Amino acid sequence: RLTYDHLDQLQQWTMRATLDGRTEEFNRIRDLHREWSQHPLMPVLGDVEPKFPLNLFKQNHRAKKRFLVRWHKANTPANWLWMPRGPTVVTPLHRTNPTQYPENWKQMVQ
């Protein structure tokens, strides 16, 4: 859980980094966001997360929660095929390299 004092400390840290010219942390954060923040492709027809069978005589809530927990534990972010990842994808919303970021504005002249 994130607190407003954490937000203030983060603001102070980014102010210090900007004033000192250290931009490697900014570049790595932006690259991580670019890699993890792509638009999920729409699933094809018939894609549905499995549901636990229902019985009326004796519903085992422990097994009901166990199945969900195990399934989501297996569904790690590494194998999230729905979310595009890797270098083969094209992202026409984010700057691809640190060279074209505004902190490198000296290069784009004339």
Binding site: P92, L93, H94, R95, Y101, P102, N104, W105, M108, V109, Q110
Partner: peptide, 16 residues
């Protein structure tokens, strides 16, 4: 457009 100052380089990709 050509970048003249630091402000001009703060433009996000056009498609966004």
């Amino acid at each position: 457009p050509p970048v003249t100052c630091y402000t001009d380089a703060c433009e996000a990709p056009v498609a966004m």
